[PDB]
Amino acid sequence: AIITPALISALKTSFQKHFQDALATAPSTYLQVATVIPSTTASNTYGWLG
Amino acid sequence: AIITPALISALKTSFQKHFQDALATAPSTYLQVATVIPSTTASNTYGWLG
């Protein structure tokens, strides 16, 4: 006649991490639509002739 | 010739086991819809991070 706190609830229970980091995020797709340009200062300026 | 119909008429037979295992049962399928998580106590508690 063990008291409920020390029962299947807590005393008899094993922790498992099968659900961890299983639901993923949508795959990255920004490369297909955008291109990467590096920078090394506060801003970047672009110019073309015509 | 003449004989009781409970000895010869009963023993003039050849038992065969063709009918055994003639049919089958539906194949296992729960693998395609479930994973197997072994347990070592009364219950298993699961926890994952957000």
Automatic annotation (TrEMBL), chains A, B:
<protein>
    <recommendedName>
        <fullName>Bacteriophage Mu GpT domain-containing protein</fullName>
    </recommendedName>
</protein>
